[PDB]
Amino acid sequence: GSSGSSGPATCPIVPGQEMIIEISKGRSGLGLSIVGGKDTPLNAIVIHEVYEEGAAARDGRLWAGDQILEVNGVDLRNSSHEEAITALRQTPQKVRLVVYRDEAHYRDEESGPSSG
């Protein structure tokens, strides 16, 4: 065997692999946003922005531009935009979700004018 015990927490995200991530709400609720769902041009829940002033950020596992497939044991690939929202507010202290990434097109040239 390669690994015996593996946890969704304190662990990186593997590409082309549906991995799970567990985040503790601690005190205040999560601080992120989603986009897509049903009646949308994308049948895959995407994270528009992840407010750094939230539990989700307190971890640093979910990065803006990710694609969720399920949450707290609730399929989202079908759930409507709103549905996906409630599914996030209906989660206990330990919020678990399944994220998926791609193993190609590693944008090596991603840098703005960094103006100020």
Curated annotation (Swiss-Prot):
It is found in: Cell junction, Tight junction; Apical cell membrane; Cytoplasm, Perinuclear region. The modification Phosphothreonine is found at T91. Expressed in renal tubules (at protein level). Expressed in bladder, testis, ovary, small intestine, colon, heart, skeletal muscle, pancreas and cerebellum in the brain. Residues 20-103 form the PDZ domain. Forms a ternary complex with PALS1, CRB1 and CRB3. Component of a complex whose core is composed of ARHGAP17, AMOT, PALS1, INADL/PATJ and PARD3/PAR3. Forms a heterotrimeric complex composed of MMP5, LIN7B and PATJ; the N-terminal L27 domain of PALS1 interacts with the L27 domain of PATJ and the C-terminal L27 domain of PALS1 interacts with the L27 domain of LIN7B. Component of a complex composed of CRB3, PALS1 and PATJ. Interacts (via N-terminus) with PALS1/PALS (via PDZ domain). Scaffolding protein that facilitates the localization of proteins to the cell membrane. Required for the correct formation of tight junctions and epithelial apico-basal polarity. Acts (via its L27 domain) as an apical connector and elongation factor for multistranded TJP1/ZO1 condensates that form a tight junction belt, thereby required for the formation of the tight junction-mediated cell barrier. Positively regulates epithelial cell microtubule elongation and cell migration, possibly via facilitating localization of PRKCI/aPKC and PAR3D/PAR3 at the leading edge of migrating cells. The L27 domain (also called Maguk recruitment domain) is required for interaction with PALS1 and CRB3, and PALS1 localization to tight junctions. This is InaD-like protein. It comes from Homo sapiens. The gene is PATJ. The chain holds residues 1425 to 1527 of 1801 of the full protein.
